[PDB]
């Protein structure tokens, strides 16, 4: 066994690095702490133990994360909710983990809400712009709400009418250009868009099983967008945009059918042009991922460590 | 969500009572504590919360339990293992829960061992006789070992050659008459027997999926024996002895196929003539049971409460 909480949410980030791409993945342990595992290049994953705690949250808290590089080092923000269902944030400030300012705002989250986050613009010569997406209510038809950091936290938009506790994918497809994916009450995944000065309904839609976990990434100049969804113990789906949307397809391995456990979640990261990881939870209880390689395709990669309880090896 | 640890082992007991049969079920929470839930007659289940802790054990500890009535009240013994893989015992002494004497003996248990226990003879006019079954080693071909209480703890028999971490069912089919069920290295469930002065190989056998969780009960004068086995997310099987063994059959509900989660465990209790519960773990994460009623048959009964984490209703 491991210390990975069954039906923990997952969050993941990636960035380019001299010597190999850096990845971090966040998950919850049996004690409610949020742990980090790390990967550099194709070296074995590290971390995931009781010595890798970065924060804590209510048991079964939703999670989301973003990163950028600043003059102070690598910045990471991990979003979660506390035991009072208040939206909360852990900060890696370039050198240490601390509690961030978002928790003091008092944003109430529905108990079954998921979280998504995106960021654009942050660098060693420009400030970050963060957007966090959440729900206030658990019921069918609830909207998605946005909290905004472009110098200070303030409320943003609300939109959509969703399945209860919908999955939410969020990606900045270009500077100040946002795409948000969620599952509407007809079980179709839908898209909401911001290009300049307003939100509008996007052209993407796809039928999916009720209650799928959703993630989204993007890169490049077209731009390229990939939207992932998965119901636990069903195969992963991807929809791809390269100027138009393709027909969604399954990412699967005939020797390892439907490798996730029931009622589990996914997360995706990306960096470069292009490296992609899609994390899932499997028997073990293990943290697994799909990986994309151009000219090999998709495969299940190395297992991410998630601790070993006392009394076991 | 609940506080029921996913892939927790389960133990259960039952006894006849004026006003309705009493049941207790034991399971592990996310903190490693062993909790109790209670039922009287067909009234709703109670307990299962953080206020119902009876002991603690290593995370994912095996569990077993027995009960009898004494001059001091209802006696319960719950077997588990600590963080050093030492066989341990919690005692309900008729009025309170305390730590029992078995832990001080120093019986090492294989980290992946299951536990079973049986009892006969204990009453308000006779002392109890307890037997606890465990494994020392995790590997294929390991034996089952027995620890014995008939006034003080001492080692008993060892027998069998099993699948790694085999399920173990144990029942006293009559006074000092024992039947032990386990899965041998050919994946057949096999039977070991004690009637008077020696162990011998029994006539029961049945093919089963590798790694099934096993439970066994018995009652009456024939006697009647029932052996249960289940692999997580497969249907429950029962083999029945009433003088001869029947062909094993599935206990299932066409509207709720394979209702347990992968890699989960079962436990059975019985009392009277006859009331039977077979507990399993399902999405929720929930503690469920099959129940037998003469002239209705088998059905899935009321859900057993297993707590609600803070931040959820
Ligand atoms: C150098 O430190 C490593 O990388 C940082 C960006 C953080 O992810 C930190 O938790 C990790 O230990
Ligand atoms: C400087 O403040 C830190 O970084 C900002 C970009 C926000 O993530 C804020 O909540 C956090 O406390
Ligand atoms: C300028 O407007 C703010 O930033 C945009 C990119 C959107 O996140 C919008 O909902 C928010 O109010
Ligand atoms: C112009 O079209 C809009 O932007 C594209 C990048 C896609 O997100 C598409 O689904 C959306 O309707
Ligand atoms: C070139 O292939 C396309 O882009 C890759 C980065 C993957 O998203 C793949 O599933 C998709 O078909
Ligand atoms: C009266 O007390 C109830 O029954 C006893 C036999 C024990 O199961 C105890 O934990 C429970 O609360
Ligand atoms: C009196 O001693 C108690 O009851 C016996 C029957 C045993 O269960 C023993 O380990 C326990 O401490
Ligand atoms: C008398 O022998 C003891 O009791 C029997 C009923 C068996 O449990 C045996 O293995 C044990 O040594
Ligand atoms: C006499 O036969 C023995 O006892 C019966 C009660 C059964 O346990 C049977 O499988 C075993 O071989
Ligand atoms: C009378 O029916 C037999 O005994 C019952 C108590 C159950 O064990 C049932 O599955 C079995 O077929």
Author numbering:
A (entry chain A), B (entry chain A): 1 to 313
How did the manuscript describe this experimental structure?
Lectins are carbohydrate-binding proteins that are widely used in medicinal research for lectin-staining of cells and tissues as well as for glycoprotein analysis. One of the predominantly used lectins is AAL from Aleuria aurantia—the first fungal lectin with a solved 3D structure. There are five slightly different binding sites per AAL monomer and there is evidence for the presence of at least one so called high-affinity binding site.
The protein adopts the 6-bladed β-propeller fold highly similar to a previously determined structure of the AAL/Fuc complex. All five binding sites are very similar and the main difference among them is that three of them contain the Trp residue which creates CH-π stacking interaction with bound Fuc residue, whereas the remaining two binding sites contain the Tyr residue which also creates CH-π interaction. The single point mutation N224Q reported previously to affect the binding affinity of site 5 is not directly involved in ligand binding. In binding Site3, where CH-π interaction is also mediated by tryptophan residue (Trp194), only g(‒) conformation was found. This is stabilized by a water molecule bridge between NE1 of Trp194 and the backbone O of Gly176. The observed Eint suggest that both stacking Trp conformations are equivalent in strength even though they create slightly different interactions with αMeFuc.
